[PDB]
Amino acid sequence: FSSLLQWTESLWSYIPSVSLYDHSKITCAIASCIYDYLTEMNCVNYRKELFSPYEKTKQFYQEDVFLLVSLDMSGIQDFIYNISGSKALKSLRSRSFYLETMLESLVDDLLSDLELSRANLLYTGGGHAYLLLPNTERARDVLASFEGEMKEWFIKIFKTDLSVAIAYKACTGEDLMNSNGTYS
């Protein structure tokens, strides 16, 4: 699917739906999160439970179903500039690339732990990563375990030179729909 997502983005980047890719990706992520939430709740019929009363569509935008997740890497500039000059030119280019590549790996690992795709990562800042995840208990436990494992690995490799902090917040469909201005 990753190849399909990469293809979709190049083709739909400069065409209106927010471009079409942006919308398609966001839809995919939201869908995956909803599917995981419904699997956690074990609904008998997704369509009937959602569209039957025709008010359940509105109420489902009020159930806490999504998680806004931010993972941030601490120690970027110090790591790039904790160098002696002997190989500075080389080191400075390599350290910045290594830190960005490591951040990519992180989220990929996290996605591999959630069986999700890159559509669920809204964007990656240098040293930063914002994602949208399902609010399932399994996903929450996966996030906790991933935070613990990342803490252990960073302490085992760089000690206090680099760290990673992961924080999540629960939200509903209306929050994603910028109702009442709560999203920002």
Next chain:
RNA sequence: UUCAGCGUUCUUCGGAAUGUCGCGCAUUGGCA
């Protein structure tokens, strides 16, 4: 016919610096 000099200019006009370099090399860095 004799007696006398007297007055006016006291320097003038141009050119007033120019061109050339305006730090270099070694260590260091960089490449390997």
